[PDB]
mmCIF file of N, CA and C in Angstrom:
data_model
loop_
_atom_site.group_PDB
_atom_site.id
_atom_site.type_symbol
_atom_site.label_atom_id
_atom_site.label_comp_id
_atom_site.label_asym_id
_atom_site.label_seq_id
_atom_site.Cartn_x
_atom_site.Cartn_y
_atom_site.Cartn_z
ATOM 1 N N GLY L 1 118.834 118.250 81.158
ATOM 2 C CA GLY L 1 117.769 117.236 81.007
ATOM 3 C C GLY L 1 118.278 116.398 79.801
ATOM 4 N N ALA L 2 119.256 115.259 80.181
ATOM 5 C CA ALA L 2 119.563 113.831 79.378
ATOM 6 C C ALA L 2 118.251 113.900 78.882
ATOM 7 N N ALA L 3 117.147 113.399 79.789
ATOM 8 C CA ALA L 3 116.150 112.758 79.197
ATOM 9 C C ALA L 3 115.089 113.637 78.307
ATOM 10 N N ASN L 4 115.152 114.981 78.223
ATOM 11 C CA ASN L 4 114.486 116.021 77.870
ATOM 12 C C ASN L 4 115.234 115.689 76.076
ATOM 13 N N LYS L 5 116.653 115.565 76.137
ATOM 14 C CA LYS L 5 117.405 115.515 74.974
ATOM 15 C C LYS L 5 117.426 114.217 73.922
ATOM 16 N N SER L 6 116.936 113.220 74.995
ATOM 17 C CA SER L 6 116.674 112.133 74.105
ATOM 18 C C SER L 6 115.413 111.970 73.495
ATOM 19 N N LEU L 7 114.180 112.583 74.557
ATOM 20 C CA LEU L 7 113.163 112.876 74.136
ATOM 21 C C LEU L 7 112.912 113.390 72.833
ATOM 22 N N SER L 8 113.625 114.577 72.744
ATOM 23 C CA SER L 8 113.582 115.671 71.491
ATOM 24 C C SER L 8 114.396 114.912 70.465
ATOM 25 N N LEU L 9 115.229 114.440 70.659
ATOM 26 C CA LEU L 9 116.060 113.669 69.110
ATOM 27 C C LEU L 9 115.116 112.373 68.666
ATOM 28 N N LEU L 10 114.091 111.529 69.902
ATOM 29 C CA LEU L 10 113.428 110.579 69.322
ATOM 30 C C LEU L 10 111.760 111.592 68.876
ATOM 31 N N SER L 11 111.752 112.634 68.929
ATOM 32 C CA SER L 11 110.719 113.321 68.217
ATOM 33 C C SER L 11 111.123 113.745 66.999
ATOM 34 N N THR L 12 112.245 113.919 66.697
ATOM 35 C CA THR L 12 112.581 114.077 65.317
ATOM 36 C C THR L 12 112.737 112.575 64.274
ATOM 37 N N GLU L 13 112.951 111.619 64.939
ATOM 38 C CA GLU L 13 113.031 110.132 64.368
ATOM 39 C C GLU L 13 111.879 109.685 64.365
ATOM 40 N N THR L 14 110.909 110.158 65.023
ATOM 41 C CA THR L 14 109.207 110.084 64.702
ATOM 42 C C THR L 14 108.995 110.291 63.508
ATOM 43 N N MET L 15 109.045 111.899 63.371
ATOM 44 C CA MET L 15 108.771 112.400 62.221
ATOM 45 C C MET L 15 109.020 111.984 61.230
ATOM 46 N N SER L 16 110.288 111.655 60.990
ATOM 47 C CA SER L 16 111.015 111.104 59.928
ATOM 48 C C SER L 16 110.243 109.945 59.326
ATOM 49 N N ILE L 17 109.830 108.892 60.540
ATOM 50 C CA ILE L 17 108.896 107.639 60.079
ATOM 51 C C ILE L 17 107.812 108.182 59.280
ATOM 52 N N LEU L 18 107.050 109.059 60.247
ATOM 53 C CA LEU L 18 105.610 109.247 59.932
ATOM 54 C C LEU L 18 105.608 110.086 58.664
ATOM 55 N N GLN L 19 106.488 110.919 58.493
ATOM 56 C CA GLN L 19 106.308 111.918 57.364
ATOM 57 C C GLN L 19 106.205 111.076 56.193
ATOM 58 N N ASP L 20 106.768 109.893 56.114
ATOM 59 C CA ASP L 20 106.721 108.959 55.109
ATOM 60 C C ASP L 20 105.343 108.069 54.932
ATOM 61 N N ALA L 21 104.689 107.952 55.948
ATOM 62 C CA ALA L 21 103.389 106.988 55.976
ATOM 63 C C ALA L 21 102.421 107.689 55.305
ATOM 64 N N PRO L 22 101.514 106.898 54.836
ATOM 65 C CA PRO L 22 99.952 107.232 54.195
ATOM 66 C C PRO L 22 99.370 108.249 55.491
ATOM 67 N N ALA L 23 98.623 108.949 55.257
ATOM 68 C CA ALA L 23 98.009 109.877 56.341
ATOM 69 C C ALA L 23 98.921 110.078 57.508
ATOM 70 N N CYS L 24 100.272 109.894 57.642
ATOM 71 C CA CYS L 24 101.219 110.385 58.500
ATOM 72 C C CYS L 24 100.995 109.641 59.899
ATOM 73 N N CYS L 25 100.377 108.343 59.548
ATOM 74 C CA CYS L 25 100.062 107.594 60.713
ATOM 75 C C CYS L 25 100.222 106.198 60.220
ATOM 76 N N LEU L 26 100.633 105.571 61.462
ATOM 77 C CA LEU L 26 101.356 103.865 60.988
ATOM 78 C C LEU L 26 100.638 103.167 62.430
ATOM 79 N N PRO L 27 100.254 101.871 62.126
ATOM 80 C CA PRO L 27 99.973 100.960 63.496
ATOM 81 C C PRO L 27 100.859 101.024 64.216
ATOM 82 N N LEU L 28 100.771 101.046 65.796
ATOM 83 C CA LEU L 28 101.819 100.974 66.692
ATOM 84 C C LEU L 28 102.921 100.127 66.813
ATOM 85 N N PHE L 29 102.363 98.521 66.051
ATOM 86 C CA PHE L 29 103.245 97.467 65.985
ATOM 87 C C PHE L 29 104.180 97.588 64.786
ATOM 88 N N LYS L 30 103.652 98.507 63.759
ATOM 89 C CA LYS L 30 104.403 98.641 62.497
ATOM 90 C C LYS L 30 105.841 99.868 62.818
ATOM 91 N N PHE L 31 104.856 100.937 63.690
ATOM 92 C CA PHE L 31 105.765 101.776 63.813
ATOM 93 C C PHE L 31 107.182 101.334 64.491
ATOM 94 N N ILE L 32 106.923 100.467 65.917
ATOM 95 C CA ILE L 32 107.898 99.919 66.454
ATOM 96 C C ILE L 32 108.932 99.101 65.876
ATOM 97 N N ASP L 33 108.459 98.476 64.805
ATOM 98 C CA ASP L 33 109.331 97.532 63.859
ATOM 99 C C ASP L 33 109.945 98.408 62.912
ATOM 100 N N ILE L 34 109.719 99.285 62.382
ATOM 101 C CA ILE L 34 110.097 100.044 61.540
ATOM 102 C C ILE L 34 111.392 101.035 62.377
ATOM 103 N N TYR L 35 111.110 101.399 63.395
ATOM 104 C CA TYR L 35 111.749 102.319 64.177
ATOM 105 C C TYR L 35 112.994 101.611 64.734
ATOM 106 N N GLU L 36 113.018 100.210 65.379
ATOM 107 C CA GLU L 36 114.107 99.235 65.803
ATOM 108 C C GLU L 36 114.769 98.991 64.629
ATOM 109 N N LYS L 37 114.253 98.698 63.732
ATOM 110 C CA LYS L 37 115.173 98.388 62.244
ATOM 111 C C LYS L 37 115.961 99.565 61.759
ATOM 112 N N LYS L 38 115.403 100.761 61.765
ATOM 113 C CA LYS L 38 116.059 101.936 61.084
ATOM 114 C C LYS L 38 117.067 102.449 62.482
ATOM 115 N N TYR L 39 116.939 102.195 63.599
ATOM 116 C CA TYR L 39 117.816 102.840 64.520
ATOM 117 C C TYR L 39 118.463 101.852 65.171
ATOM 118 N N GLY L 40 118.503 100.668 64.905
ATOM 119 C CA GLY L 40 119.029 99.518 65.686
ATOM 120 C C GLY L 40 119.414 99.394 67.030
ATOM 121 N N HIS L 41 118.155 99.835 67.769
ATOM 122 C CA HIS L 41 117.917 99.518 69.475
ATOM 123 C C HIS L 41 116.441 99.826 69.574
ATOM 124 N N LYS L 42 115.981 99.335 70.749
ATOM 125 C CA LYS L 42 114.718 99.111 71.262
ATOM 126 C C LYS L 42 114.060 100.471 71.449
ATOM 127 N N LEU L 43 112.817 100.200 71.059
ATOM 128 C CA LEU L 43 111.768 101.620 71.685
ATOM 129 C C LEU L 43 111.133 101.474 72.573
ATOM 130 N N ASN L 44 111.298 102.256 73.644
ATOM 131 C CA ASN L 44 110.717 102.675 75.079
ATOM 132 C C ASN L 44 109.279 103.095 74.598
ATOM 133 N N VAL L 45 108.242 102.472 74.275
ATOM 134 C CA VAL L 45 106.753 102.906 73.948
ATOM 135 C C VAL L 45 106.472 104.035 74.840
ATOM 136 N N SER L 46 106.595 103.715 76.188
ATOM 137 C CA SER L 46 106.043 104.787 76.976
ATOM 138 C C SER L 46 106.668 106.417 76.501
ATOM 139 N N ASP L 47 107.748 106.538 76.213
ATOM 140 C CA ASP L 47 108.432 107.354 75.789
ATOM 141 C C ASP L 47 107.690 108.454 74.413
ATOM 142 N N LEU L 48 106.545 107.630 73.723
ATOM 143 C CA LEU L 48 106.000 108.074 72.851
ATOM 144 C C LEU L 48 104.644 109.104 73.400
ATOM 145 N N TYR L 49 104.401 108.578 74.245
ATOM 146 C CA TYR L 49 103.556 109.164 75.244
ATOM 147 C C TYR L 49 103.876 110.658 76.019
ATOM 148 N N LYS L 50 105.346 110.804 75.919
ATOM 149 C CA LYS L 50 105.578 112.178 76.448
ATOM 150 C C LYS L 50 105.522 113.053 75.069
ATOM 151 N N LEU L 51 105.793 112.385 73.798
ATOM 152 C CA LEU L 51 105.867 113.694 72.709
ATOM 153 C C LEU L 51 104.527 113.934 72.550
ATOM 154 N N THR L 52 103.868 114.669 73.591
ATOM 155 C CA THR L 52 102.589 115.011 72.981
ATOM 156 C C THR L 52 102.122 116.639 72.084
ATOM 157 N N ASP L 53 103.657 117.031 71.907
ATOM 158 C CA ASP L 53 103.678 117.866 70.895
ATOM 159 C C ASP L 53 104.024 117.596 69.358
ATOM 160 N N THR L 54 104.113 116.373 69.260
ATOM 161 C CA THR L 54 104.498 115.518 68.104
ATOM 162 C C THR L 54 103.797 114.611 67.700
ATOM 163 N N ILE L 55 103.078 113.868 68.370
ATOM 164 C CA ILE L 55 102.179 112.769 68.169
ATOM 165 C C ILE L 55 100.897 112.649 69.032
ATOM 166 N N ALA L 56 99.902 112.036 68.408
ATOM 167 C CA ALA L 56 98.665 111.547 69.352
ATOM 168 C C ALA L 56 98.833 110.172 68.932
ATOM 169 N N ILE L 57 98.565 109.353 69.816
ATOM 170 C CA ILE L 57 98.499 107.876 69.915
ATOM 171 C C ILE L 57 97.087 107.530 70.175
ATOM 172 N N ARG L 58 96.165 107.069 69.232
ATOM 173 C CA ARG L 58 94.628 106.738 69.150
ATOM 174 C C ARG L 58 94.616 105.131 69.693
ATOM 175 N N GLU L 59 93.616 104.903 70.220
ATOM 176 C CA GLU L 59 93.200 103.675 70.700
ATOM 177 C C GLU L 59 92.216 103.026 69.476
ATOM 178 N N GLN L 60 92.440 102.101 69.199
ATOM 179 C CA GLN L 60 91.475 101.555 68.202
ATOM 180 C C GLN L 60 90.951 100.119 68.726
ATOM 181 N N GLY L 61 89.650 99.520 67.987
ATOM 182 C CA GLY L 61 89.367 98.147 68.642
ATOM 183 C C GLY L 61 90.401 96.968 68.438
ATOM 184 N N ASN L 62 91.340 97.000 67.354
ATOM 185 C CA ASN L 62 92.294 96.000 67.100
ATOM 186 C C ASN L 62 93.989 96.496 67.596
ATOM 187 N N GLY L 63 94.138 97.776 67.966
ATOM 188 C CA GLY L 63 95.403 98.287 68.142
ATOM 189 C C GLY L 63 95.542 99.460 67.894
ATOM 190 N N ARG L 64 96.755 100.394 68.664
ATOM 191 C CA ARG L 64 96.819 101.981 68.525
ATOM 192 C C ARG L 64 97.154 102.044 67.145
ATOM 193 N N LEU L 65 96.970 103.398 66.984
ATOM 194 C CA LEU L 65 97.592 104.158 65.749
ATOM 195 C C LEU L 65 98.253 105.169 66.355
ATOM 196 N N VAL L 66 99.344 105.398 65.541
ATOM 197 C CA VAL L 66 100.429 106.542 65.999
ATOM 198 C C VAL L 66 100.179 107.344 64.770
ATOM 199 N N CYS L 67 99.857 108.686 65.228
ATOM 200 C CA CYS L 67 99.158 110.067 64.184
ATOM 201 C C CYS L 67 100.148 111.043 64.478
ATOM 202 N N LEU L 68 101.042 111.521 63.369
ATOM 203 C CA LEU L 68 101.642 112.661 63.484
ATOM 204 C C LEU L 68 100.923 114.063 63.582
ATOM 205 N N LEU L 69 100.982 114.998 64.131
ATOM 206 C CA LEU L 69 100.221 115.810 64.722
ATOM 207 C C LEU L 69 100.283 116.890 63.293
ATOM 208 N N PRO L 70 99.374 117.385 62.915
ATOM 209 C CA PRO L 70 99.095 118.058 61.568
ATOM 210 C C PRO L 70 100.207 119.341 61.377
ATOM 211 N N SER L 71 100.503 119.895 62.580
ATOM 212 C CA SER L 71 101.733 121.036 62.143
ATOM 213 C C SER L 71 103.175 120.287 62.251
ATOM 214 N N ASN L 72 103.176 119.075 62.214
ATOM 215 C CA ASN L 72 104.555 118.453 61.918
ATOM 216 C C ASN L 72 104.506 117.726 60.760
ATOM 217 N N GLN L 73 103.653 117.470 59.852
ATOM 218 C CA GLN L 73 103.400 116.744 58.469
ATOM 219 C C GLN L 73 104.470 117.433 57.694
ATOM 220 N N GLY I 1 88.865 123.955 85.754
ATOM 221 C CA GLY I 1 87.624 123.766 84.803
ATOM 222 C C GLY I 1 86.939 122.415 84.992
ATOM 223 N N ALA I 2 86.152 122.398 83.685
ATOM 224 C CA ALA I 2 85.365 120.897 83.228
ATOM 225 C C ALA I 2 86.552 120.157 83.185
ATOM 226 N N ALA I 3 87.578 120.099 82.205
ATOM 227 C CA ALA I 3 88.464 119.214 81.707
ATOM 228 C C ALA I 3 89.142 118.511 83.192
ATOM 229 N N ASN I 4 89.488 119.227 84.189
ATOM 230 C CA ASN I 4 90.256 119.199 85.358
ATOM 231 C C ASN I 4 89.457 118.201 86.292
ATOM 232 N N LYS I 5 87.938 118.793 86.503
ATOM 233 C CA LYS I 5 87.224 118.191 86.780
ATOM 234 C C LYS I 5 86.830 116.585 86.265
ATOM 235 N N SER I 6 86.331 116.463 85.209
ATOM 236 C CA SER I 6 86.392 115.124 84.155
ATOM 237 C C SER I 6 87.446 114.248 84.633
ATOM 238 N N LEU I 7 89.082 114.943 84.694
ATOM 239 C CA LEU I 7 90.131 113.993 85.004
ATOM 240 C C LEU I 7 90.037 113.511 86.407
ATOM 241 N N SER I 8 89.961 114.569 87.412
ATOM 242 C CA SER I 8 89.602 114.153 88.923
ATOM 243 C C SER I 8 88.762 113.279 89.267
ATOM 244 N N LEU I 9 87.351 112.978 88.308
ATOM 245 C CA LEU I 9 86.587 112.128 89.043
ATOM 246 C C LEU I 9 87.290 110.422 88.077
ATOM 247 N N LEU I 10 87.986 110.829 87.099
ATOM 248 C CA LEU I 10 88.404 109.609 86.468
ATOM 249 C C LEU I 10 89.327 108.951 87.541
ATOM 250 N N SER I 11 90.198 109.829 88.052
ATOM 251 C CA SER I 11 91.355 109.494 89.148
ATOM 252 C C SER I 11 90.689 108.837 90.356
ATOM 253 N N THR I 12 89.837 109.131 90.896
ATOM 254 C CA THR I 12 89.009 108.754 91.905
ATOM 255 C C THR I 12 88.306 107.322 91.478
ATOM 256 N N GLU I 13 87.649 107.452 90.332
ATOM 257 C CA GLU I 13 87.077 105.942 89.987
ATOM 258 C C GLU I 13 88.063 104.817 89.642
ATOM 259 N N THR I 14 89.362 105.263 88.984
ATOM 260 C CA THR I 14 90.242 104.562 88.755
ATOM 261 C C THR I 14 91.186 104.078 90.104
ATOM 262 N N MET I 15 91.413 105.094 91.019
ATOM 263 C CA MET I 15 91.813 104.282 92.540
ATOM 264 C C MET I 15 90.864 103.441 93.258
ATOM 265 N N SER I 16 89.579 103.431 93.028
ATOM 266 C CA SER I 16 88.712 102.739 93.514
ATOM 267 C C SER I 16 88.630 101.568 92.956
ATOM 268 N N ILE I 17 89.074 101.422 91.859
ATOM 269 C CA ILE I 17 89.216 99.786 91.030
ATOM 270 C C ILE I 17 90.631 99.346 91.231
ATOM 271 N N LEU I 18 91.469 99.746 91.642
ATOM 272 C CA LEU I 18 92.924 99.462 91.827
ATOM 273 C C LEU I 18 93.307 99.048 93.272
ATOM 274 N N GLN I 19 92.542 99.715 94.205
ATOM 275 C CA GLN I 19 93.362 99.659 95.325
ATOM 276 C C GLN I 19 93.445 98.395 96.101
ATOM 277 N N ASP I 20 92.292 97.360 95.678
ATOM 278 C CA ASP I 20 92.771 95.994 96.244
ATOM 279 C C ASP I 20 92.860 94.853 95.124
ATOM 280 N N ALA I 21 93.274 95.390 93.880
ATOM 281 C CA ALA I 21 93.818 94.416 93.016
ATOM 282 C C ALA I 21 95.585 93.619 93.558
ATOM 283 N N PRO I 22 95.560 92.900 92.956
ATOM 284 C CA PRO I 22 97.168 92.357 93.059
ATOM 285 C C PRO I 22 98.288 93.611 92.719
ATOM 286 N N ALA I 23 99.010 93.866 93.889
ATOM 287 C CA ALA I 23 100.061 94.924 93.278
ATOM 288 C C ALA I 23 99.364 96.245 93.267
ATOM 289 N N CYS I 24 97.979 96.332 93.174
ATOM 290 C CA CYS I 24 97.379 97.790 93.213
ATOM 291 C C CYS I 24 97.398 97.801 91.543
ATOM 292 N N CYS I 25 97.241 96.638 90.584
ATOM 293 C CA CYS I 25 97.595 96.650 89.174
ATOM 294 C C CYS I 25 96.502 95.667 88.519
ATOM 295 N N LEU I 26 96.037 96.182 87.589
ATOM 296 C CA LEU I 26 94.980 95.340 86.719
ATOM 297 C C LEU I 26 95.806 95.555 85.194
ATOM 298 N N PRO I 27 95.722 94.300 84.526
ATOM 299 C CA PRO I 27 95.699 94.062 83.069
ATOM 300 C C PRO I 27 94.647 95.111 82.440
ATOM 301 N N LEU I 28 95.164 95.940 81.231
ATOM 302 C CA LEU I 28 94.333 96.908 80.998
ATOM 303 C C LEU I 28 93.010 96.275 80.239
ATOM 304 N N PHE I 29 92.879 95.102 79.909
ATOM 305 C CA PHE I 29 91.753 94.604 79.373
ATOM 306 C C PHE I 29 90.407 94.238 80.600
ATOM 307 N N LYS I 30 90.868 93.782 81.832
ATOM 308 C CA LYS I 30 90.545 93.538 82.887
ATOM 309 C C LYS I 30 90.036 94.820 83.496
ATOM 310 N N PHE I 31 90.875 95.915 83.462
ATOM 311 C CA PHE I 31 90.476 97.176 84.034
ATOM 312 C C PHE I 31 89.310 97.936 83.070
ATOM 313 N N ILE I 32 89.302 97.564 81.927
ATOM 314 C CA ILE I 32 88.376 97.974 81.085
ATOM 315 C C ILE I 32 87.068 97.506 81.476
ATOM 316 N N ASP I 33 87.246 96.277 81.599
ATOM 317 C CA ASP I 33 85.970 95.450 81.990
ATOM 318 C C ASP I 33 85.335 95.537 82.895
ATOM 319 N N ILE I 34 86.213 95.649 83.977
ATOM 320 C CA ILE I 34 85.732 96.203 85.612
ATOM 321 C C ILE I 34 85.126 97.478 85.573
ATOM 322 N N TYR I 35 85.763 98.520 84.834
ATOM 323 C CA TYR I 35 85.304 100.089 84.841
ATOM 324 C C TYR I 35 83.736 99.807 84.211
ATOM 325 N N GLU I 36 84.014 99.142 82.906
ATOM 326 C CA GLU I 36 82.421 99.367 82.109
ATOM 327 C C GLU I 36 81.298 99.208 82.794
ATOM 328 N N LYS I 37 81.661 97.939 83.696
ATOM 329 C CA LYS I 37 80.476 97.186 84.414
ATOM 330 C C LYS I 37 80.162 98.116 85.598
ATOM 331 N N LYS I 38 81.096 98.926 85.884
ATOM 332 C CA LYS I 38 80.718 99.560 87.646
ATOM 333 C C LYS I 38 80.116 100.988 86.931
ATOM 334 N N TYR I 39 80.666 101.422 86.187
ATOM 335 C CA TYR I 39 80.021 103.150 85.696
ATOM 336 C C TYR I 39 78.971 102.975 84.430
ATOM 337 N N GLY I 40 78.889 102.116 83.964
ATOM 338 C CA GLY I 40 77.948 101.845 82.780
ATOM 339 C C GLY I 40 78.277 102.612 81.459
ATOM 340 N N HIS I 41 79.134 102.961 81.422
ATOM 341 C CA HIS I 41 79.845 103.451 80.263
ATOM 342 C C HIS I 41 81.170 103.528 79.767
ATOM 343 N N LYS I 42 81.342 103.727 78.463
ATOM 344 C CA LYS I 42 82.746 103.571 77.888
ATOM 345 C C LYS I 42 83.696 104.048 78.863
ATOM 346 N N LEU I 43 85.165 103.374 79.090
ATOM 347 C CA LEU I 43 86.371 104.244 79.519
ATOM 348 C C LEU I 43 86.928 104.699 78.262
ATOM 349 N N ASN I 44 87.373 106.133 78.459
ATOM 350 C CA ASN I 44 88.131 106.898 77.716
ATOM 351 C C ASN I 44 89.689 106.460 78.111
ATOM 352 N N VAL I 45 90.389 105.566 77.145
ATOM 353 C CA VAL I 45 91.372 104.952 77.701
ATOM 354 C C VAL I 45 92.596 106.010 77.363
ATOM 355 N N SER I 46 92.264 106.871 76.284
ATOM 356 C CA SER I 46 93.348 108.131 76.612
ATOM 357 C C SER I 46 93.472 109.054 77.601
ATOM 358 N N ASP I 47 92.266 109.365 78.265
ATOM 359 C CA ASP I 47 92.125 110.212 79.603
ATOM 360 C C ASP I 47 93.100 109.522 80.440
ATOM 361 N N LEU I 48 93.051 108.218 80.628
ATOM 362 C CA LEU I 48 93.939 107.595 81.586
ATOM 363 C C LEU I 48 95.272 107.943 81.707
ATOM 364 N N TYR I 49 95.915 108.276 80.315
ATOM 365 C CA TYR I 49 97.148 108.595 80.137
ATOM 366 C C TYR I 49 97.228 109.922 80.513
ATOM 367 N N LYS I 50 96.312 110.789 80.988
ATOM 368 C CA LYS I 50 96.822 111.907 81.520
ATOM 369 C C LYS I 50 96.677 112.011 83.308
ATOM 370 N N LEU I 51 96.535 110.959 83.675
ATOM 371 C CA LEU I 51 96.213 110.727 85.271
ATOM 372 C C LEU I 51 97.609 110.537 85.634
ATOM 373 N N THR I 52 98.941 111.306 85.237
ATOM 374 C CA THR I 52 100.029 110.917 85.664
ATOM 375 C C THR I 52 100.584 111.145 86.996
ATOM 376 N N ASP I 53 99.694 111.576 87.789
ATOM 377 C CA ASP I 53 99.912 111.824 89.138
ATOM 378 C C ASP I 53 99.010 110.598 90.090
ATOM 379 N N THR I 54 98.328 109.926 89.468
ATOM 380 C CA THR I 54 97.593 108.358 90.080
ATOM 381 C C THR I 54 97.915 107.370 89.581
ATOM 382 N N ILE I 55 98.318 107.251 88.382
ATOM 383 C CA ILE I 55 98.324 105.704 87.826
ATOM 384 C C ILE I 55 99.629 105.655 86.660
ATOM 385 N N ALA I 56 100.482 104.526 86.538
ATOM 386 C CA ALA I 56 101.490 104.425 85.371
ATOM 387 C C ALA I 56 100.857 103.323 84.706
ATOM 388 N N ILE I 57 101.187 103.416 83.427
ATOM 389 C CA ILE I 57 100.431 102.490 82.520
ATOM 390 C C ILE I 57 101.827 101.811 81.766
ATOM 391 N N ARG I 58 101.933 100.607 82.191
ATOM 392 C CA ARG I 58 103.109 99.890 81.839
ATOM 393 C C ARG I 58 102.821 99.162 80.495
ATOM 394 N N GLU I 59 104.014 99.315 79.612
ATOM 395 C CA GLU I 59 103.879 98.629 78.269
ATOM 396 C C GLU I 59 104.654 97.087 78.859
ATOM 397 N N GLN I 60 104.104 96.428 78.530
ATOM 398 C CA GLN I 60 104.592 94.707 78.693
ATOM 399 C C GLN I 60 104.014 94.081 77.462
ATOM 400 N N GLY I 61 104.850 93.062 77.298
ATOM 401 C CA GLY I 61 104.841 92.278 76.221
ATOM 402 C C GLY I 61 103.394 91.739 75.935
ATOM 403 N N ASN I 62 102.939 91.011 77.258
ATOM 404 C CA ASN I 62 101.366 90.332 77.103
ATOM 405 C C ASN I 62 100.639 91.465 77.371
ATOM 406 N N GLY I 63 100.552 92.790 77.214
ATOM 407 C CA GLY I 63 99.631 93.519 77.098
ATOM 408 C C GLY I 63 99.875 94.673 78.494
ATOM 409 N N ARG I 64 99.370 96.123 78.206
ATOM 410 C CA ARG I 64 99.303 96.863 79.281
ATOM 411 C C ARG I 64 99.098 96.267 80.415
ATOM 412 N N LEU I 65 99.642 96.960 81.574
ATOM 413 C CA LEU I 65 98.964 96.952 83.149
ATOM 414 C C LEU I 65 99.143 98.669 83.389
ATOM 415 N N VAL I 66 97.705 98.561 83.820
ATOM 416 C CA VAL I 66 97.107 99.576 84.659
ATOM 417 C C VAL I 66 97.815 99.659 86.129
ATOM 418 N N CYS I 67 98.527 100.546 86.593
ATOM 419 C CA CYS I 67 99.180 100.432 87.839
ATOM 420 C C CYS I 67 98.863 102.010 88.725
ATOM 421 N N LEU I 68 98.614 101.783 89.914
ATOM 422 C CA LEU I 68 98.927 102.489 90.945
ATOM 423 C C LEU I 68 99.922 103.053 91.379
ATOM 424 N N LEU I 69 100.401 104.413 91.629
ATOM 425 C CA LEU I 69 101.784 104.972 91.996
ATOM 426 C C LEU I 69 101.500 104.339 93.440
ATOM 427 N N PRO I 70 102.935 104.319 93.963
ATOM 428 C CA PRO I 70 102.734 103.988 95.478
ATOM 429 C C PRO I 70 102.196 105.510 96.408
ATOM 430 N N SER I 71 100.933 105.026 96.952
ATOM 431 C CA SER I 71 100.001 106.127 97.249
ATOM 432 C C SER I 71 98.763 105.281 97.620
#
């Protein structure tokens, strides 16, 4: 599972960004910007929705919030 | 159980809305408007992401698209 391997590494990179954020969450636009600058390549946002053991993505009126699940903080 | 039946109904409602849309696809803002008008309550957009056998939600630059899979 090349895909599973890439998703697993992405989960660690997600953890690394969000463990430094306040309340371990970030607006989606900001997460994308932080990620792409940090790793130097494009984030495929649909991959975040596969990481259901790592993060929840919450809808809000003005945009999504990417939230690190309590066990991963 | 209840969760599967709740998702199963959302699937049927989602298909009904998308069947005759262009390319069986609606921008998310438009799917929400049509859904809320048809069903008279708020759509649980996170539950749509659980319908991985019925729809794909496409990230695009101009906003999300809700797309019925081949079927």
